[PDB]
Amino acid sequence: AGVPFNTKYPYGPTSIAVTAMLKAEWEDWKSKRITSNGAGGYKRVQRDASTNYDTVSEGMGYGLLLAVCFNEQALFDDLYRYVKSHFNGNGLMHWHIDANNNVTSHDGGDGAATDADEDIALALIFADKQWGSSGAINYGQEARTLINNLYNHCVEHGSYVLKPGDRWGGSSVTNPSYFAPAWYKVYAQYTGDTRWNQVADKCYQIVEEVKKYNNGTGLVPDWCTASGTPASGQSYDYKYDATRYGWRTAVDYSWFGDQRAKANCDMLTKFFARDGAKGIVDGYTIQGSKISNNHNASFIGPVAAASMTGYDLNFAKELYRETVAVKDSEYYGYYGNSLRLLTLLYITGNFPNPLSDL
Length: 358
Ligand SMILES: [Cl-]
Ligand SMILES: [Cl-]
Ligand SMILES: [Cl-]
Ligand SMILES: [Cl-]
Ligand SMILES: [Cl-]
Ligand SMILES: [Cl-]
Ligand SMILES: [Cl-]
Ligand SMILES: [Hg+2]
Ligand SMILES: [Hg+2]
Ligand SMILES: [Hg+2]
Ligand SMILES: [Hg+2]
Ligand SMILES: [Hg+2]
Ligand SMILES: [Hg+2]
Prior knowledge:
The PDB classes it as hydrolase. The entry lists the keywords endoglucanase family 8, Hg derivative, hydrolase. It forms a monomeric assembly. Endoglucanase A from Clostridium thermocellum at atomic resolution. The protein: endoglucanase A. The longest helix has 18 residues, at 114-131. The chain is globular and about 50 Å long. It has 358 residues and is mainly alpha-helical. The chain is built from 12 helices and 4 strands, in the order αβββααβααααααααα. It starts with 18 loop residues before the first helix and ends in an 11-residue tail after the last helix. The strands form 2 sheets. The chain has a two-stranded antiparallel ribbon. The protein has one domain: Glycosyltransferase (Alpha/alpha barrel). Bound molecules: chloride ion (7 copies) and mercury (II) ion (HG) (6 copies). One mercury (II) ion binds at residues 174, 176, 206, 224-226, 228.
C-alpha cells in the first residue's frame, strides 16, 4: 500500500523524475515535524523554530496527506485524533494552536482555514480507500462529516465562491491557493453531492478573471475578490500563499484531464521558463515583476507540479531535478520542505486519484 503506488495518471506524464529517495525524505520530514509534545496524547505536525514549534491546521492537512501516501496508519490516526480534538463549533479545525496545545489569541485561532480542512478531508478519503474504515477510525464517516461542514460553512451557496474561513470572506476576499477543483470532483463523486462540481467551475471562472490582470504570465494573487481584483489590505502578489496554486491545480489535469487546468498551468510554467529552474524566486507581482529573490523550497516544487500539464517536458525534468536539489535549512524547515515533499509525491506519480484503482 502507498508509495510506490505504481499507478499511471490517466492524462499527462506518469512521472517527470525515486522510491528510496521519497521514503528517506519522508523519514526525515517525520523525524523533524511530528511530535507528541503539546499533542494532547496524540501526535501533531509542528512548524519550525521560526514560529516556536506551534501548529497550524494546514500542517495537519499536509501530515495526513503524507502519512496515508506513505502507508503510516498508526501515525495518521494519531494526527487525526489531534485534528478532531481541535474541531471548532462548525466542525472545522482551529487554524492556530501553540506548542502547549492552546488555541492562539488575537489572531482568530478559533476560526478555521479552508485549505487545511480540504486537505484533511481528501486524506480521510485516501485512508478509507487504502486501509478501510472498520478499524479504530471510521475514515469514510469522518470524511463525509467534514465535507458536509466544508460545504455548509465554506461555500457561498448562491455563487459557489470558496470562502477562506468558516466565519469570514467569500466574494470580497478569498485565496486562489486554496482552490482545488480535483479535490472537489473527488468530493462530488465520493459523497454524491454534485454541488461540488459548481464550486470547481467557479474556481476556474475566477482564474479566468485574473487573466485580465496577470499580463499573460499565468500567475495568481495570494488574495483577491471574486472579480479577480485586489482584496483590501491583503497581498495581491504571487507569494507564499499563491505558490501552492500550481500544485493543487495541475492535479485536475492528471486525474481528470481538465483542459482548463492545462491551459492555465501551461501559462504559469511558460512564465517560469523565462529564467529557468534555477531562477525561481519567492515573490512576484502577478504581472511577473520580481519582488523577492530567494530561491527556496516554497516555490520550486509547485512549478514542477504545474509543468506536469505539458508546456515543455524537458523543462519539467529540470524542475524535478531542482525540486530535489533545493531543501531549506531547518530553522525555516516547515513550510517549503512540506511543499517540496507533497509536490515530489505528485510529480513522481505517487499522488493518484483516491477513487481510482490503487
Ligand atoms: Cl491523501
Ligand atoms: Cl500528498
Ligand atoms: Cl472562488
Ligand atoms: Cl475555514
Ligand atoms: Cl469556488
Ligand atoms: Cl475569488
Ligand atoms: Cl488551473
Ligand atoms: Hg499523498
Ligand atoms: Hg495521499
Ligand atoms: Hg472553512
Ligand atoms: Hg473558487
Ligand atoms: Hg479571488
Ligand atoms: Hg493550473
